[PDB]
Design a protein around this ligand. Structure first.
Ligand SMILES: CN(C)c1ccc(N(Cc2cc(Cl)cs2)C(=O)Cc2cncc3cccc(O)c23)cc1
Ligand SMILES: CN(C)c1ccc(N(Cc2cc(Cl)cs2)C(=O)Cc2cncc3cccc(O)c23)cc1
Lengths: 301, 305
C-alpha cells in the first residue's frame, strides 16, 4: 500500500550527463553514443538571445569553440549540427554508459521523471507532467538548461523532454529530443507567457481510483453522471474535458475497483462542489493531477 | 523557480541491488563489497513469521540454502551471520559497483530517498521522512522488503533505512543497515500499530521559507513569538516542540529571506489556529513537513552530487 509521487531510478540517465561550455555559457548535455545533445542557445550570448540567428551563429563556430567535459575527461568534438532547437555535438568517443534508448514526444497529461543537473552533475530527481498549456511545473535554476525528462519502461529509456527556458510565471518550457518545442514557445528572450493552466481531469480520476485501491472511500457517492454533464461542470472549475478515450483508458481501474468511470466522475463533481472538509485523499488536501492511469496501475500492482 | 519533492540521484544505489531467495521467499538485498545485506525475515516462511527464533532458524540454514541473483549472474555465498534484524551473506565476489558509503542512523524529522525494488530490480525512487512515530509514509507492495533509503553527502552514500514491514495503518516500518528497528516494532507477525504521529515543525518552517523564496508570501505577518508560546500552542496541535537547535539550523534561511525564525513561527502559529483560509502554499493545501532545512537549501541553491 501507500501512494507516492515516484520517479524512475535515475541511474541510466546519470551515466549520460555531461557539461557543455561555449564561450562563457555553461549548461548540461546528454551524451549518447558519439553525440552530445544540448539546447542550441548554448551558442548564444545573453545579448544574442533576443533575436538569434542560430544558423548564422553556428557556422561561425569551430569545434574548438565547444568545451565538453565528462568529469575529469574533456571530450573532443568532431563536428556540430543543428536539429530544430537542439544542437548535436559529434564527439571522438562513444559513451560506454549509453543505455538502450528511444526519443519520444509526449502528449499533455503525460508524466515523466526529471533529472535536474548543474554543470553536468545531478542535483536531484523529481516527477513532472506535461501541462495542458504545454509548460511543465519543474524546479529549475539557471544552469539547469539541458537537463532531461524521461520514462524508463522496460530497460529502455525514453527521452521526452529537454529543458530550455523558465517563463515569467515560474513554470518551464522545453523541447523533445528532436529539438521541437512543446507548446508555441521559441528559444528567444522575447516576451512569452504560458496560457491559463487547467487540471488534467483523467489523471485526477486515476488518482481517485488509486485512493479507493488503497482503501479510501469517504469521497464516494451514490450518483452517476453523463459525460456531457460532467464536462459542463468540470469546465467550470478550469478542468480539462474528459473524452470517451479517457473513459476507455480508465476502464481497467473501474473493473479492478468495481466503480464505474461515470460513477467516479460524479464523486469528482461533488468534490469540486464541496472541497475536502478538512479531509485528505492519499495524504493530499487537494486533488492530484500528475499521476496517469498507467502510473496508478504500475504503482498499485 | 519551482519547488518539488526531490529524491537523490539513485544511480550509485541501483548498482548494489540484488535478489535474495531462501526457500519460497524472494526479496531484495544490498550488495556492498563482499557482503549482501537483507532482512533476516528472508529465512522465515509467512507461517514462521508468527513466532520465530531467528538464531535457531539460522543454524538450520546452509550457504547453499540462500540464492543470490545479480541480474543474470548468480552470486556464490561463502558465509552467513546475523546482525540484529538484518542477515549478512558473505559472497565470493566483491561488488565492482560498490560506491563510497557509510551506514548512518537518522533521527525523526530527517528525510531520505527510498529506492523501491522488486526481485532485486529498482522500480522507482521517492523522498520520505522518518516520522516522529518512527514510521515512514512510503509506497511498498509485497516483495519490496530489502529496499533501502539513503542520502548522498558529497560523493558518500549514507544508507539509513532498510524496509521490513507494512503496519495495518498502511504506513511502513524498517531498520537501519545494522538491523536496529526504527521505532517500537519487532520482526514478527503480531499486533503492532503506529503510535500517534506529529508534525515535524522545523520542516514546516523550512518549507514556509521555501515558499517565500518562490514568492509565495501571503501568510507573512507583522508579529513575533517566544519559543514558549509557540511550543505551548504547537503541543496543542500535535506539532513537535521547536528547540533552540532547530532555530539555529533555520538560521541561513532566516538570513536569506530576512524573516526571523520567531517571526515565521508567528505566521505558523496563526496557520495552526486559523487554517489555510482557502489558500495554498507552494501549490499545497496542507502544511508540508517532509522537507528539512538542508533540503530547502540544496534545492534552492542547486547543490549537485
Ligand atoms: C546565456 N544563455 C544561453 C541563456 C539561456 C537561457 C536563458 N533563459 C531565458 C531563455 C531561454 C529561452 Cl529557450 C528563451 S529565453 C532561461 O530562462 C534559462 C533558465 C531555465 N530554467 C530556469 C531558470 C531560472 C532563472 C533564470 C534562467 O535563465 C533560467 C538565459 C540565458
Ligand atoms: C514471506 N515473508 C518472509 C514475509 C515477511 C514479512 C511480511 N510482512 C509482515 C511483517 C513484517 C515484519 Cl518485520 C513483521 S510482520 C510484511 O509487512 C512485508 C511487506 C512489506 N512491505 C509491504 C507489504 C505490502 C503488502 C504485504 C506485505 O506483507 C508487505 C510478510 C511476509
Amino acid at each position: 500500500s501507500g501512494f507516492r509521487k515516484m520517479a524512475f531510478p535515475s541511474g541510466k540517465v546519470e551515466g549520460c550527463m555531461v557539461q557543455v561550455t561555449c564561450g562563457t555559457t555553461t549548461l548540461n548535455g546528454l551524451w549518447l553514443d558519439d553525440v552530445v545533445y544540448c539546447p542550441r542557445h548554448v551558442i548564444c550570448t545573453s545579448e544574442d538571445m533576443l533575436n538569434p540567428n542560430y544558423e548564422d551563429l553556428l557556422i561561425r563556430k569551430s569545434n574548438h569553440n565547444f568545451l565538453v567535459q565528462a568529469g575529469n575527461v574533456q571530450l573532443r568534438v568532431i563536428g556540430h549540427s543543428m536539429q530544430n532547437c537542439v544542437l548535436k555535438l559529434k564527439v571522438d568517443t562513444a559513451n560506454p554508459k549509453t543505455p538502450k534508448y528511444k526519443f519520444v514526444r509526449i502528449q499533455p497529461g503525460q508524466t515523466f521523471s526529471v533529472l535536474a543537473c548543474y554543470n553536468g552533475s545531478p542535483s536531484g530527481v523529481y516527477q513532472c507532467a506535461m501541462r495542458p498549456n504545454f509548460t511543465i511545473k519543474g524546479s529549475f535554476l539557471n544552469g539547469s538548461c539541458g537537463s532531461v525528462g524521461f520514462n524508463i519502461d522496460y530497460d529502455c529509456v525514453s527521452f521526452c523532454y529537454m529543458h530550455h527556458m523558465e517563463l515569467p510565471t515560474g513554470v518551464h518550457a522545453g523541447t523533445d529530443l528532436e529539438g521541437n518545442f512543446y507548446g508555441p514557445f521559441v528559444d528567444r528572450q522575447t516576451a512569452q507567457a504560458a496560457g491559463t493552466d487547467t487540471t488534467i481531469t483523467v489523471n485526477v480520476l486515476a488518482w481517485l481510483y488509486a485512493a479507493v485501491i488503497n482503501g479510501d472511500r469517504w469521497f464516494l457517492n451514490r450518483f452517476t453522471t453523463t459525460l456531457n454533464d460532467f464536462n459542463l461542470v468540470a469546465m467550470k472549475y478550469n478542468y480539462e474535458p474528459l473524452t470517451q478515450d479517457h473513459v476507455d483508458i480508465l476502464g481497467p481501474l473501474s473493473a479492478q475497483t468495481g466503480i464505474a468511470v461515470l460513477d467516479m466522475c460524479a464523486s469528482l463533481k461533488e468534490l469540486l462542489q464541496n472541497g475536502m472538509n478538512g479531509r485528505t485523499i492519499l495524504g493530499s488536501a487537494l486533488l492530484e493531477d500528475e499521476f496517469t492511469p498507467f502510473d496508478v496501475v504500475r504503482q498499485c500492482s
